[PDB]
Design a protein around this nucleic acid. Structure first.
Lengths: 154, 363, 362, 362, 156
RNA sequence: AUAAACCGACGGUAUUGUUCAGAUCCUGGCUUGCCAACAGGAGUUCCCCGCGCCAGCGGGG
């Protein structure tokens, strides 16, 4: 039983402009593997255990949108990514259809572009767990949350 | 092996939207656990019926409708100089089961394919009621004996002889039931597809340039695999005992259409007018689809086309050797390849392939 | 061994080879997971009504049962219940040639349903001789029955292999002919994502236009067909009967399983796919290999390959544990192979049928 | 072999962003398993309509809008001296429904292309309708008889005759539905493109210390544009116009497709490049040469030359395999020797245009 | 079907002449031109092409010098041997940006850079590890190299 | 040879027509890669042919 802490987020907040600049300048998570500042960032949590590597790549990749793109808000349960993107009001549901139909690296890319455009508020550990698994049910649940919230706030 | 003729087509399409959902999304289907873009077989069929090539080489397509109130006017226009209006009304009334009132709008049970030739024929046959009066059920019993005589008039149909029809009401439920004769599959892509979205706007000349919410149109390119199959005997029967050679000519027309015709959906704005890159035809005692050649979604090496051709040829070799099939098999490809094996004869042009079909695979 | 086991893995392109009363694909829950199903009756009809069946079984040399050959035996099997004169009367009414006139070819054994029916006829002509209605008078009232058995006496192999024809003039309990081949429900080896085709019907006279809407469920998938053949029962219902002939029929069954497909919506979806794998194995007891896919197969590179793999891997550990013994042969279109030998690998289907025809000997 | 005229254009563009997303992303499309930069057909068409060349050689473009309140005032201004305002209001109300007047904002269902000529003609008709007290239904019945007379007005609004018009409300649903006549594809690059990212800043002249940041996606690329004109449909849409008259419009479309570039980000990315290849061929069946680049071209000495080469080779393969569709003519600025011989090589563009004017002859 | 450590040993024992011929080479493709290479690499992989590229890489690295790459067996407590990244990091002479450029290089170029690093580093490492990474030399191996270096410096 | 046996849910169907994502923007300022150094010991240079041989000289590849 090993969980990635929320400390990562805090670390990302506290990290210098240089390394964050190196990280933001990235197209794909493998190119995130390419840069050293990433390894220096993600070691404590950590990177040296392959069970965690994919999850860390996704999480850090999403955070790489910007220092204050993903806004953490404490909670019964906190606001989910679907609810967040829906509350933002800037996102069109078709692009989320795209997101659910995307494959491998592409989806993450599509996800990042959304975050930058959304400036969402959400409970970071939830998004962290969903990125940890990112199965079919995470996708489906994301779309469900978005559609239901948008339908409930129209 | 010479009753069924199998048509396989590999055709690559540039970015387009050839068939839509109820949400205006690209029709899709899951094959081998992977998403494939799909084109409806009904779409291909109608695309063929309403094509110019069909009009030039096969003839006039059937008129499918429920509106008998318009159909009576059409039939009165095209058959008025040959028959009396009351006779035509009684004819259409007998065939459909509804009554021709001279009203504004009376509808049928469902969409029905009508060919004017067989209707004229039924006018001639119901003109025998102008003779020594037979009861309509009597006349029906008379017509029941010789169905071939009715199917001879279906040479002005053919699309009905190919795709069949079903009647629920009228006299057509007992005289117009056509079963065969062409089995066509839904065109699916040989590979996994992530559909793109066109985010468009509409500039208002009296307000724009200004802000606006955007519209979406799902589109995608892809290498499609079309399959068709013709039961020659059933076609001959459907045309009233027509000769085999005739059925083979029609078959060649089907080959050409399946190789060239593309559904006109979104073509004004996307224009994916691409010819087939491969067309193989093989005669067999039993229908055979090579869809399982793409059960494992082909992955792009230099595009999706070449590995699709390659996979197709490999799977054809495996199946052919495994089940000991002996055609009557010919392949036409645009690309230079390493295909095999004898005697799946390579045809340099499409017309040579069609000619090879006309001469019953021996040419 | 007495039983022949036929296992087929066959992939189908997007189609709908079997519907329920609400135009939806037939399914079945296996291992807690939904599987698309093709009912056994659909497969068995697709076989029994096929042209191959009509060629190799509809026109077999053993289809005609000549009653004149069964003169002696029928006399000694029914001598306990009827008198000889009654039997001779019945045969004379059924053939209908009286003379004996020994064919110089008197059979050794008789098919059960035959003695079952002609016994009934014996009873009828007995009570008819007691009443008494003359031969013509009673032959008038037994016309449909006599014709009914007369058509059945010319379809021996069909009845022996597939059973009676759901409307055969049979009455007695022995007239209930089962077997000799058992066809199982074909289920998918995996959990299926069903697609919904959303179609319209264009009106050529109002193309503006209000569209006629409709839906139809369809799905592609890798199906596992199972079937078995009871050779003893096949020999008994053709009795007869040499084992070699029964094997010769078994080959036809193998071929039909490897090739034949139901015709449901094949005019619009055309799932004319051939079997990608087929294994035959002799046994003292019939066993399906369905539990190979009890845990739903998940797609690595398609559903076909991991299905083949799951099947072989199941056969490896499970085969010897159960009473499978030998012998076995497998015809496929793709490696790998089962690590276990004693399962001969056949390059073509014809070699496999030839293997079956020689009682599994190499 | 002369109803359809096919236009193929190969044009290379320096680093730019000619078509954008709603998120400042370059429009793209996946072809042959590779990403291509895309320019939407709508962008090309509008880029043609609002071009000065169109203004000089074809005429005035149509007014596409929903605001019937603005259009009311416009029609009152341009048709004020020739017609009564009572008639204009009623006409506009009849074509869409139902403006009347005095409303600050009247909006139709969707953006509609309006030409003032058609509206003036309709005013001439409804004037008679008001004179003889014809019911609007009867007026519709009369007008529906001769649609060609309505289509004659599209000579002052050719972009509708080329791009078509859809109507939902008003009488336009019965009289204004226009099909064809020009089919244009989305422009895609013949090669794979990994889009570059420009990292720009905005200098505050009142501060020397911290950085601003901005990202703008851009890329250079060799685009393949395809167009197709159905001449018969074009003549029909213009009210039975002569073929000679349609071919001139066709030539103008060739010129614009060869020269016109969308004005997106051209102030910062001046990508004003002419086409390096323009081939036009007459066929009775529409043919796109997009599959020449399904196998994405790889740069040898740039992308342009191997693009021309691949194009020529594919055209040769299609020509040989499917037979020669009809007359063909090519115009290039490149050092590439053509391989197929049945295509007339044109030194200059105006010679190609002249070749098209004469129906593919000399 | 795997290349042994014997190659290294062989490289150690080979005479100065052939070593001189091999050492003065610019690219791994240019290594094919000289015969002493064929004589050295003959036992292990020729003519099975699967090893050829790898061999070209390995020898090329070895071509840095006779005692540039110092081999050290893995300690029983170490569980895994010192890796190339860890080696270059421990050397202290190498700047990380050149390993960045090493991860960004393509085909022959990277080997050119790598050799140039070794000569400047005089690293100690477990040779089978480096051989194993050189056999494939995929993106993951490169990134792993960078991992080892950066992580070693940051952690120690 | 089991509420078993024998045992199709079947046939018919375009989802279609219209649509720029547009306009504004320096990534700027500061940096030695320096210190030490014979390439010299060595006649091996792998296969044939001719003539010598306390020596070796040649001809081919």
């Amino acid at each position: 039983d090993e969980i990635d802490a929320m400390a990562l987020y805090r670390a990302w907040q506290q990290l210098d402009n240089g390394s964050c600049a190196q990280i933001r300048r990235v197209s794909e998570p493998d190119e995130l593997r390419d840069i050293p500042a990433f390894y220096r960032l993600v070691q404590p949590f950590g990177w040296e255990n392959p069970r965690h590597q994919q999850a860390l790549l996704r999480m850090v990749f999403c955070l790489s949108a910007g220092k204050n793109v993903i806004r953490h808000q404490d909670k019964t349960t906190g606001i989910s990514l679907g609810r967040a993107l829906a509350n933002s009001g800037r996102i069109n549901e078709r692009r989320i259809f795209q997101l659910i139909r995307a494959d491998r690296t592409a989806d993450m890319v599509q996800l990042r572009r959304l975050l930058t455009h959304a400036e969402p508020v959400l409970d970071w550990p939830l998004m962290a767990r969903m990125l940890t698994w990112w199965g079919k049910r995470e996708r489906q649940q994301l779309l469900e949350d978005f559609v239901l919230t948008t339908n409930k706030n129209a | 092996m010479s009753n069924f003729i199998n048509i396989h087509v590999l055709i690559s399409h540039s970015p387009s939207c050839l068939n839509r959902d109820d949400m205006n999304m690209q029709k899709d289907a899951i094959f081998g656990g992977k998403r494939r873009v799909r084109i409806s077989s009904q779409s291909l069929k109608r695309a063929m019926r309403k094509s110019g090539y069909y009009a030039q080489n096969i003839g006039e397509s059937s008129l499918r409708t429920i509106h008998l109130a318009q159909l009576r006017d059409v039939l009165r226009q095209k058959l008025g100089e040959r028959f009396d209006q009351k006779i035509i009304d009684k004819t259409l009334a007998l065939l459909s089961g509804k009554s021709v009132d001279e009203a504004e709008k009376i509808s049928a049970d469902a969409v029905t394919p009508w060919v004017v030739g067989e209707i004229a024929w039924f006018c001639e046959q119901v003109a025998k009621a102008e003779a020594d009066n037979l009861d309509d059920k009597k006349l029906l019993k008379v017509l029941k004996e010789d169905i071939a005589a009715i199917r001879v008039n279906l040479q002005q149909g053919v699309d009905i002889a190919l795709s069949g029809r079903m009647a629920t009401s009228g006299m057509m439920t007992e005289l117009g039931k056509v079963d065969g004769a062409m089995s066509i599959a839904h065109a699916i892509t040989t590979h996994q597809v992530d559909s793109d979205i066109d985010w468009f706007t509409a500039v208002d000349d009296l307000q724009e340039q200004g802000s606006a919410h955007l519209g979406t149109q799902e589109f995608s390119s892809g290498v499609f695999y079309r399959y068709a199959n013709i039961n020659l005997a059933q076609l001959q029967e459907n045309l009233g005992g027509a000769s085999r050679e005739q059925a083979l000519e029609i078959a060649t027309h089907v080959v050409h259409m399946l190789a060239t015709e593309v559904p006109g959906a979104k073509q004004r704005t996307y224009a994916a007018f691409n010819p087939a890159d491969m067309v193989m035809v093989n005669f067999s005692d039993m229908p055979l689809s090579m869809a399982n050649a793409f059960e494992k979604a082909v992955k792009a090496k230099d595009g999706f086309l070449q590995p699709s051709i390659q996979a197709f040829n490999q799977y054809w070799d495996r199946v052919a050797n495994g089940y000991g099939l002996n055609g009557a098999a010919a392949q036409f490809s645009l690309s230079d390849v390493d295909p095999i094996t004898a005697q799946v004869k390579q045809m340099p042009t499409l017309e040579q392939l069609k000619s090879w079909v006309r001469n019953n695979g021996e040419a």
